Write a protein that binds this ligand. Structure first.
Ligand code: ADP
Ligand code: ADP
Ligand code: ADP
Ligand code: ADP
Ligand code: ADP
Lengths: 375, 375, 375, 375, 375
């Protein structure tokens, strides 16, 4: 730094802009991926001294704002804020120039192809960065576990992926991405608060909804059996005092939202459970490889941190998995910051310098340079 | 070794690469002739530590690989892999230099003229081997036994040979070759199983078919009498559990594939079984040899070790053979390494040392040294 | 009929249930072979008229039904409906008694051996028909075309066969069958639409996928060469309006799924396309057979009605064919019902009166009569 | 004819049933001596309309058949077809009744004595023929040259003969027959295709092998000297494009198979060269007769039509022949049809009517009438 | 021997090397004159144990050999091997040096002038032999019979002799030699089986033929009457189970082959009968010599031992010989060693030692010392 290239590590995901420096094991800046916009209206004389709201600063105020989500479904809908997000990352959190170091940002797999170019364009040309790489999300989570073969089950905010990866980067398989992760479960809960009685309509309390979900809603081994227990619950029934005033009694609700993740039928969707994809991708592969795919079940992303998520994959997996192989869940103590931890690993590499896309490359090999390095 | 020339004893055949040192008593290194290649696909950051997997290292994996077979019919299909094989044999499976040992390899009788030269060349030019000879397959099973005359029914893995042998070795007027050994039987077993109800499409589980064959498909004493027992299947069936959650009950199939051995008509092949050729080759031989050819029916190679295999040649041969000579089937308890063990004995003789072709001789007489020394 | 024995001709395969009578030029009753099942749910006042939908009746509505396919892989996956399908054939769509006429059905090559009997047993024992035979799929397609010698590339409606045929009918050997089919392709198109930007899921729109395939998706002469022309689409992009209200611009898609037929490598499957097998099967054959196989490339089945596929076989076939024999495609003008037409010819011969199984033989000799006649 | 006896001329040899009429110089029917048998198997509806295959009709199809050889080694193994051969000759080629004319067939010298009777038996008694004679093969070839003393060297398909004949029919000498002619050379070539690399196993391509031999494989003056020339051949090395697809490179092979005829050591036999028999038979005869035996070296039969066969007998003969006599090869422009040309000569004789065996004679002088006229 | 000079007694003839010492009663060492040479070829590490198999050692094995003959027609055809034949006879069976013992050999009457000297030369010059006499062959059977005068019909194996012998030394006026004995009979049996339906031409199995002749083949009483007995078959045909399971029914052949002895006419020889020459030589002699010549028709040599041979000469002789005297066949019990016994006698008298030629006498009067005593 100031004479060494030394990159950053940015996991500009759809849930947290997990930024931090190269070779670190903690992301310095962690702040949401919601950009805020007013709705309070009125006159002014004094003001909040802002009018453009970004990350944690956006989050701060919710009572005066409607919280827009720049990245939905791994597609960045609004690019105008993205320079300013990254200006909030480099200048205003990490306290660095875009010029001093590259920037490793994340690509959510099977991304819309125009975004890959569009992003770089904002960086190099408009925000002068010496280099950058838009890595493949899921792959970074493999390296985080220290695994080098397995089935990476990354359920981050916006997208879930069942990615079988081999020692050397895999050839197209049933490597897949699906929207069914954390945001979606946030949107399901609100459905179910509609038939409850408690009111939660807008963006501003939707984030509060996402909070009520994360820290309580344990993953039932089977919904139906804990459903019957709901009748004379004692440990299923507790009140989650809303931390700004209200009691939010949650009975059946607690293991109703987590079960939805693996059974999209509770929404009224036809999508496959994430444990179905697990079977599909592993069975497809040669008989002698299934043993190691089922041995190494990597489960990263914050969504796979609900209480009792671990014991859920012990029956779900054994269902449509044979008796000819060991079945063992890999779930590292922390796993929310999983794509960011992996990029840090790459940045400790000097080959990643030459596996990243240079400033000069953009002008020298046209815009298609992007897809030339990310394949 | 390390003090004397002391060769290798190598059975570079199409079934097992039976490697070892000369003067050794067993092939220390023994591993099938399979070259592995990827098909993991997906996201790789790890590495299987090869791309062109070979031998035992390939054999480990089956679920990540596709299995090529480099010597088919005792004919080296691709010599480029043979080069990678020997680089794995000498250096990494025997942990010796070839710039030290001579090498005894095997030749399936009556091969292409080129194989003999192609083999010698890779040895002298690409391993600087002090000397080597690629002795003639079937003949060696004769030296193993201590026998000096007989009819060698070497059924290796792609090739069957009816070599009536004498100490002044038989001329090409009695010796015969026909493709009908072990690999050819494997692709029939699955054939008749496709209509059963199990699937053997990919290569890696074709190998599994080869396993099922050896340790459960016994040779029918009379196909027709065991066919009739099929009405009351009980002794017929017996499940071979395959650990991917399946059970493989095999009925008439257990003895159906072995009768194909003796009747190529079920293949669609118009050729004669192994018990017919026996007659042909003795009837070609001189009258004053035929009683002892029948005394000395040597039945070698790993294919001729299925349960009940030997006893079929006690009734079939005797069928259209005379009743005027003592029929004794010579089928030792072990005849897998019949060629390998015989190849040790010759590699412990010093006249076989002067019978084999030195490094320098190859420059003195070209590639053609082979056919100048051996025929 | 009712005054003549007049059999049926039924192509009870993976296509439609093509029924009609012996010596008919068309299958008068034609309705598919998908079976429909309810899923309307809730309070119900009337009824959907039918409980289980069969044939055409099922195909009609899909928005109230979830669509089973009782026959997948040429393996009858559910027998219970087959009974109503033949009841739907004779009684309500041709309005005859099964006891009036015999029945000619199809057997796809290397069917499971129980399926052959199972079918017969419900027909003869549970519906009674004076006689019936389950003829061999491909062989009928030869006589339909009018040839008597060639390479029949009968790609029926779920199952592909490369049958080199002669005046005598080929023995198991270079007659092969493979699952690699239109219905399999259907699941490859929906696959690629994920982040590309379209959505297809359920059963009811899987059938629409099959539609999008047939009438717009033509096979590239070489994918890679029309792929690059994609760069600016003009001859690629066209719109397929889908009823629901939504436009389906298809660029590369037109020839991307169709190439996958000839190239299961893009699926992720190790298997070889059907034109590789065409070479394989011909090199397997004896040389006094090969000149007429390339000379008369008979291209049968509903898969060779795909647009730009015949022209695909002018370069695919000619590629690894000797220039020592003429090569010329025999393409019939229509060949979807090639197996039905050919079976009609057989049901219009009297030699067939003795080539079929009479009702009474089934009770008289145990169910192995099936395999006694169609071996 | 229809009032004149007028015989046929039939050379029912082991290579061609050379039939034609009396006094002709062309055999009308010439067609092989191979009777065909199926091996294609299968079902049938249409068929080839035959199931018994005979001569050229047999030859036609090879891809559906295995070609049996009724006459091997001048011994007719299958008599069942022989009526049908002769029915294919008289009725179906020459277009005559067996009753209208006699039939002159050939006896290969030193024939198994039961065959002479066995043949007549089929004719007179079962196929009513007014007369017949089974002439002595070699003798007919003498008359063809117009010679009346010499040494007849008939190398037809199955048997070679060195027959010294005097003006009047000879008294037993070293008049001999040997199997070493054309068929045998066909069987040697296949040996040598085994060590080449090209595959030719069965009956069906063996006839093709016989073709590759006849029209290319020139007779070396000395093998060994043209062997050295093989190194940088230009006129020795040419490719015999197989006329149904393949190139068949033939180098050393060309003058390797023809040299075998005179040197049985290349097989691995101990038999005498045909030029050794020449010395033996001539030297044995009185000193004053050798001059005319060596003057008239008659070389008939198709086998003695390879290119450079003529110049071969100019050194071979002079080797062990003195300086006291002229040495001159008699080899008529055509000489394949040599036994048939000679019988035509006999049939222009009216003494041959009385030197043939009458219908009536068989019943009137028992079966031994046969050996009474042929001595 | 080691106590007296004691010669050998050798009746060095074509049918056996009848060897022994002087003073013995029978030849100990008896073995046919066959020299073996390899013929199976090939490469080797084992061996046939000789490469110039000779005598008893050659006769044991035959299946790996081609059999040279060194004395034919009682003319020693080759001397090169004869030396080696004696090197196995003297050294290795008689177990003594020829550098240490004299030698009684045989002279077949009327040998060419070199033969008498050539034999003797290898014994004096190369074996150094102390003394030797090569007595005259036929004469010895005379002394063996007890006779002093008579007509010796000495028929060993190569040479038949009609020797009238005087009390002393007869003169040439009726002594004759004709080559027509045993070995000729052998080539006629294999001859007459070829038209019958068998082959046994080659040397290795010719010896077997020779075995069949001697212990089976009996001379008829007259060909013509047992030729008429041929009508019935019961007394003709009888299977000669030849070890190898080859059953050989032979009818007229047992007594068809022996007649050839008395009749060269079936060979095609214009030479007359050996039984004709007997009369001729006695009709040449004076009347005061014939009465006792007919009293003494001495019949010696192993050819004169077929059952039915002797008794035939009571009808043959009396046919064209007078009835005024006693025709008595002196037919000894056994007469295979007939020449060996006569030499044993002579070699048991010391005056024959003194009638024989010492070593030094060879140098002292050159090679012509031979014809000086034994002319
Ligand atoms: N401890 C937790 N238990 C279960 N779900 C959680 C937990 N932590 C985070 N999540 C959920 O996962 C989503 C946040 O994912 P995040 O890692 O920020 O996303 P991205 O990888 O898209 O940047 C949120 O919906 C949140 O509720
Ligand atoms: N019991 C058995 N009968 C038959 N095949 C067997 C048996 N046991 C092992 N085999 C297998 O069959 C094949 C025999 O071929 P092998 O003799 O090793 O061949 P090559 O001479 O071609 O190297 C081997 O692959 C071996 O593992
Ligand atoms: N003219 C056509 N071109 C392409 N496909 C067509 C055509 N006509 C009908 N189809 C539809 O597409 C499929 C044709 O191929 P299909 O018969 O399914 O073959 P396969 O044996 O490979 O499954 C059928 O499902 C059919 O309904
Ligand atoms: N032109 C030729 N040159 C050399 N060999 C030939 C030629 N013509 C025929 N032959 C060979 O001679 C044999 C055919 O002999 P053929 O006259 O038909 O027999 P037969 O007299 O037994 O009826 C075949 O092996 C064939 O290859
Ligand atoms: N006991 C026998 N009966 C009939 N033939 C015999 C008998 N023994 C020998 N012969 C035959 O007579 C010939 C052998 O004569 P032999 O005395 O050995 O000859 P030579 O005096 O030339 O050495 C052989 O052909 C043999 O088959």
């Amino acid at each position: 730094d100031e004479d060494e290239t030394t990159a950053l590590v940015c996991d500009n995901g759809s849930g947290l802009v997990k930024a931090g420096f190269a070779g670190d094991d903690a992301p310095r800046a962690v702040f949401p991926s919601i950009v805020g916009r007013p709705r309070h209206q009125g006159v002014m004389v004094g003001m909040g001294q802002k009018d453009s709201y970004v990350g944690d600063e956006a989050q701060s105020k919710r009572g005066i704002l409607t919280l827009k989500y720049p990245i939905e479904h791994g597609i960045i809908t609004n690019w105008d804020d993205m320079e300013k997000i990254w200006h909030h990352t480099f200048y205003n959190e990490l306290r660095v120039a875009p010029e001093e170091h590259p920037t490793l940002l994340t690509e959510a797999p099977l991304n819309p192809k125009a975004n890959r170019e569009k992003m770089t364009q904002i960086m190099f040309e408009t925000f002068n960065v010496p280099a950058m790489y838009v890595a493949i999300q899921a792959v970074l989570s493999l390296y985080a576990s220290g695994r080098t073969t397995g089935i990476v089950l990354d359920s981050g905010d916006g997208v879930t992926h069942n990615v079988p990866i081999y020692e050397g980067y895999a050839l197209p398989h049933a490597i897949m991405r699906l929207d069914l992760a954390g945001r979606d479960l946030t949107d399901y809960l609100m459905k179910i608060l509609t038939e409850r009685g408690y009111s939660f309509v807008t963006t501003a309390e939707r984030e509060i909804v996402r909070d009520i979900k994360e820290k309580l809603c344990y993953v039932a081994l089977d919904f139906e059996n804990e459903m019957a227990t709901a009748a004379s619950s004692s440990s299923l029934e507790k009140s989650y005092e809303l931390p700004d005033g209200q009691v939010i009694t949650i009975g059946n609700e607690r293991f109703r939202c987590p079960e939805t993740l693996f059974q999209p039928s509770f929404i009224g969707m036809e999508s496959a459970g994430i444990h179905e994809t697990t079977y599909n991708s592993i069975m497809k592969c040669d008989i002698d490889i299934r043993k190691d795919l089922y041995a190494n079940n990597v489960m990263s992303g914050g969504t796979t941190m609900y209480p009792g998520i671990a014991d859920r994959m012990q029956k779900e997996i054994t269902a449509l998995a044979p008796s000819t192989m060991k079945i063992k869940i890999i779930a590292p103590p922390e796993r929310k910051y999983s794509v960011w931890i992996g990029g840090s690993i790459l940045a400790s590499l000097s080959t990643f310098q030459q596996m990243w896309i240079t400033k000069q490359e953009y002008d020298e090999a046209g815009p298609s340079i992007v897809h030339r390095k990310c394949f």
